[PDB]
From Swiss-Prot:
This is Endothiapepsin. It catalyses: Hydrolysis of proteins with specificity similar to that of pepsin A, prefers hydrophobic residues at P1 and P1', but does not cleave 14-Ala-|-Leu-15 in the B chain of insulin or Z-Glu-Tyr. Clots milk. It is an enzyme of class 3 (hydrolase). The keyword 4Fe-4S does not apply. The chain holds residues 90 to 419 of 419 of the full protein. It comes from the Eukaryota.
Length: 330
């Protein structure tokens, strides 16, 4: 089997992407944030504290003839941005782009933090990291991809995120029309539960490529590109007036600037992020200070190849017995 679903930016900045997901019988369609940096499929629901729901579409298990309470199971998750959610668990039928999994753990939110409530466009998350990170207790649950894998034509999914435009998540096949050149594959460590890999270096604009190993994770659920402070300083030093602002929380730059591109290495191959992809617009409405899309990872503990980097590529998440990542230009 295969599936194919369009993923759409939630706003004009590509802060995140939503993909429609069918849950239950009859189908209830929710727009979920596919997150290769976490491993829980959780949804706003009929159980979510009413004051914490503000415009989201909710899953109502009592209206699904295939929903079953997973008795005793609870979940609770905290994300790198400080947001969080928790609740109980049902199993139900879940379909993405025509690919159906029966018995998928659907984690129903009883509580969500304010950032979730405040984002009316995201009805929940669909985790695509390794199932060892799943938070369900006392019996850890499998991701949608893990459950689908055996049925897929090939044990892979691909992320093709658009810049200010829709893109595609495919399951079970590699669309050879969706990229240019060849796909370069690179080793993955699953030791931390992430799609963790080592970039071979970087360049700023038309500058020379610096060969240096950068360990990080491919994370569709993180907006920006978080890299070591040395690398980030080298990038922003090429932008007149750019500076790191402790009050804003990162590098800012004059909105009048033209940003240089940023290249990262995948083995001997190179992925070029155009300068425009690094512009996240005014820090506040009407400001002439703009927020940078490349930021330091120094306070995180890990480097994160988020959407800024991934949307410059066609990315293969290869879930073979030994997982690997593939990157192609597009």
């Amino acid at each position: 089997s295969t599936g194919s679903a369009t993923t759409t930016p939630i706003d004009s900045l590509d802060d995140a992407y939503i993909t429609p997901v069918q849950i239950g019988t009859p189908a209830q369609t929710l727009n979920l944030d596919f997150d290769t940096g976490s491993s829980d499929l959780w949804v706003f629901s009929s159980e979510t504290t009413a004051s914490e729901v503000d415009g989201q579409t909710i899953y109502t298990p009592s209206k699904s003839t295939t929903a079953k309470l997973l008795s005793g199971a609870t979940w609770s998750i905290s994300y790198g941005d400080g947001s969080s959610s928790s609740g109980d668990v049902y199993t139900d039928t879940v379909s993405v782009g025509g690919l159906t999994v029966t018995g998928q753990a659907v984690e129903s939110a009883k509580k969500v933090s304010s950032s979730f409530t405040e984002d009316s466009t995201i009805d929940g998350l669909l985790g695509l990291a390794f199932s060892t990170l799943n938070t369900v207790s006392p019996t850890q649950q499998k991701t949608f991809f893990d459950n689908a894998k055996a049925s897929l034509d090939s044990p892979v999914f691909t992320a093709d995120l658009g810049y200010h435009a829709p893109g595609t998540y495919n399951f079970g096949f590699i669309d050879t029309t969706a990229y240019t050149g060849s796909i370069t594959y690179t080793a993955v460590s699953t030791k931390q539960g992430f799609w963790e890999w080592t970039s071979t270096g970087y360049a700023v604009g038309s500058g020379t490529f610096k060969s240096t190993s950068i360990d990080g994770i491919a994370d569709t659920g993180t907006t920006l590109l978080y890299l070591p402070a040395t690398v980030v300083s080298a990038y922003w030093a090429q932008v007149s007036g750019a500076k790191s602002s402790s009050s804003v929380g990162g590098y800012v730059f004059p909105c009048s600037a033209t940003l240089p591109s940023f290249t990262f290495g995948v083995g001997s191959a190179r992925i070029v992020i155009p300068g425009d992809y690094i512009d996240f617009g005014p820090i506040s409405t009407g400001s002439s200070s703009c927020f940078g899309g490349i930021q330091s990872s120094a306070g995180i503990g890990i480097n994160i190849f988020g959407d800024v980097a991934l949307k410059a590529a066609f990315v293969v998440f290869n879930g073979a017995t030994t997982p690997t990542l593939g990157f192609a230009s597009k």
